[PDB]
């Protein structure tokens with residue numbers, strides 16, 4: 038495979054320098070005479086004992102039990118980069134106190150305890166404790182390295198590309214020790230296993246947004262996005278490390294009583310790291326969310342099914358695809374237009390022959406209550422007849438080279454320039470370009486796909502921009518690389534909001550991403566391949582993104598490259614139906630694979646998967662509201678829900694949605710069954726197809742057929758469904774709800790439901806929403822408000838209750854505030870212990886209770 | 891005074907009271923108790939369509955906001971007003 042066009046660590050000169058420093062006695066030491074306790078931080082000088090370089094450590098305790106460590110030069114020749122726009126706020130601090138000291142150490146207490154930080158002077162070292170329990174150490178292996186800005190370490194070439202490297206060696210690095218941790222996770226994006234591997238005998242994990250053609254599986258090469266967040270889990274605690282650096286970064290992981298050591302090595306910027314002390318993984322989720330924000334609440338339609346390919350050829354094709362879904366009784370919310378819809382890959386334009394009347398095409402889709410997504414990439418064709426290019430050139434908004442000319446590289450339209458999305462004036466220009474007057478042919482049901490925003494540069498080093506290109510404020514491209522795509526995502530999402538006057542929630546899919554990208558929409562795992570192992574790896578890839586806050590994740594259903602055999606396509610639909618971002622997509626040269634083109638047995642299996650997804654939309658929507666409000670991931674590893682079950686710490690052929698559904702999709706050709714691990718002491722699980730109850734913990738052998746999607750509902754949960762599947766989610770969002778109550782062994786259950794208009798910010802600006810709590814105990818099901826601030830005018834009502842694990846009552850009695858007591862009819866299956874309550878008929882906005890007598 | 895009589899599911903299977911016909915809840919395995927609503931997954935809605943050909947549509951397209959019949963009668967309580975287009 039052709040990987041010589043991507044640097045290994047040995048070919049990255051700063052990585053080679055850093056990684057050659059091996060564990061030993063650190064030359065850095067803290068000058069305790071310089072110690073100062075301030076309003077927000079402790080500052081103390083550090084010195085390299087041999088070079089006498091002076092650094093400043095800024096140490097802070099933060100509210101929510103986190104620590105921030107920043108290290109910069111005391112007297113720098115010029116400022117180092119500090120990552121902007123990723124933190125949503127200046128983190129609230131807690132007061133540090135000197136609570137102990139000797140000749141070689143100072144002990145600090147965060148607020149009034151229980152967290153303590155021991156600063157050792159010689160050699161420099163930090164220890165983080167809760168009371169007397171050591172949580173984590175910093176520089177314990179003496180791997181700290183800080184190359185100060187001096188007056189291929191300098192000028193450097195790779196392949197035929199030359200980096201002038203005008204500032205010389207400036208790389209920074211630091212190691213962390215996690216006593217008691219044997220399992221670490223995160224730092225996407227890699228086509229690798231959920232539990233991260235030791236790097237001792239190979240390459241570090243690389244974080245550098247890059248476009249890797251036909252990327253392969255189980256390897257640590259950098260892919261399109263970079264989230265520098267690592268989670269550590271043991272039976273006893275959870276911790277997170279957030280390395281806030283936007284430059285090329287390499288991560289070494291080593292194991293050693295059990296202990297995992299983590300080392301970060303970055304090309305430039307300062308050392309800026311957050312330690313998130315848990316103790317539970319949900320505490321870590323909250324800690325990280327307070328720093329970088331939460332998943333933007335998707336408009337409801339974007340949680341439906343998306344039909345895409347490169348490329349639908351013209352307006353007639355799009356309308357034939359739209360009509361095909363209806364003629365074959367298959368739901369779909371969005372049809373996508375890839376780059377061939379534009380005029381020669383000039384974005385914001387339309388091909389004058391194949392898309393001459395885009396407003397009319399959009400009106401036809403609106404009459405079917407469907408949406409369209411158009412692709413808009415950040416490379417702008419160098420073309421004096423192209424108004425976008427002329428405006429950006431005339432206003433000086435392009436990334437520049439050192440000699441002051443606009444950077445020019447190669448992409449889809451041929452020669453192209455790259456707007457400087459780090460410049461706030463450029464982002465404002467971009468957002469205004471999405472106004473309905475500027476983006477001619479767009480309409481409120483047209484949303485956006487940002488691709489190639491690493492940025493991809495076909496004739497650039499590693500298929501990206503030169504390191505020494507120059508951005509706003511004079512920063513080099515090497516300084517900002519990993520947030521370029523995030524800025525594209527951000528400016529596009531703001532454009533869709535602004536064009537509506539601030540009312541409509543955006544939908545933007547982005548390929549490249551960074552910490553904070555969850556605020557701006559969805560991501561996907563790029564150009565996968567139509568093969569069974571790529572189907573399998575979608576779970577650990579989206580799980581690794583979920584753990585670091587990017588909940589709106591998916592992979593191309595069917596695979597982007599090559600033609601999937603029909604059985605694989607069926608299994609990929611079933612897999613994708615239970616993943617957050619659900620889009621079929623395909624390469625230009627693949628055969629057409631709209632789902633009604635297959636033989637009827639495959640069509641029926643795919644239709645069944647689509648129906649299951651649409652029915653679960655109220656559940657998906659509520660999980661995403663909880664992600665938006667709390668920072669909790671939608672798709673979850675089993676170990677997040679069972680932190681003490683060590684046999685779950687590596688599982689990646691199964692996952693949870695919230696705490697209620699466990700999914701084990703079939704991912705092998707010709708499979709006759711699957712082995713489902715059902716966790717939980719005293720837990721029960723219900724097969725949602727057969728209603729068969731199963732106790733945990735066990736590995737259940739479950740026979741499957743082509744139409745099987747192994748899904749289990751956990752005892753103690755209530756899942757809301759729309760059982761009336763229609764052609765799109767807009768058609769369903771006023772329909773009645775069916776509640777699926779899965780009884781715990783104690784005869785209890787609980788769940789939530791969020792409802793709003795499905796597409797605006799009115800839930801936030803006007804508190805126009807409902808959050809209901811449904812709870813079952815004794816023999817009574819009760820609906821109450823989980824947030825009284827929310828009211829909503831809605832016709833949604835409760836048409837049905839399905840209770841699993843219940844005996845046959847003598848009578849069923851409904852009480853609603855404002856109504857007389859009513860009697861409900863019911864059906865009971867003694868074989869399955871399933872109770873169906875007929876037509877409660879009560880508004881979802883009303884308090885009510887149902888009693889089984 | 892003498893009272894009236896109930897409804898019987900076309901597939902046999904069941905017999906339900908008269909007031910559970912078109913009561914917006916599916917009581918019949920073949921969907922026959924809900925010819926005029928969206929309540930049954932296998933039901934059908936009949937569009938008389940005077941001036942053109944009569945048409946059956948899926949029950950799921952009754953009051954879905956989309957005009958499925960030229961006479962517009964599938965949309966009677968959805969906020970979509972369908973003009974008669976049977977020409």
Ligand SMILES: COCCCCCCCCCN[C@H]1C[C@](O)(CO)[C@@H](O)[C@H](O)[C@H]1O
Nearest residue numbers: 346347375376412488563564622623625626
């Ligand atoms: C014979 O083919 C003509 C030239 C071959 C070039 C092959 C390089 C394919 C990889 C491109 N990936 C992109 C761009 C994209 O293909 C179009 O925008 C999207 O579909 C996709 O999702 C995204 O990741």
Ligand SMILES: [Ca+2]
Nearest residue numbers: 910915917923
């Ligand atoms: Ca009925």
Ligand SMILES: [Ca+2]
Nearest residue numbers: 951956958964
């Ligand atoms: Ca209709």
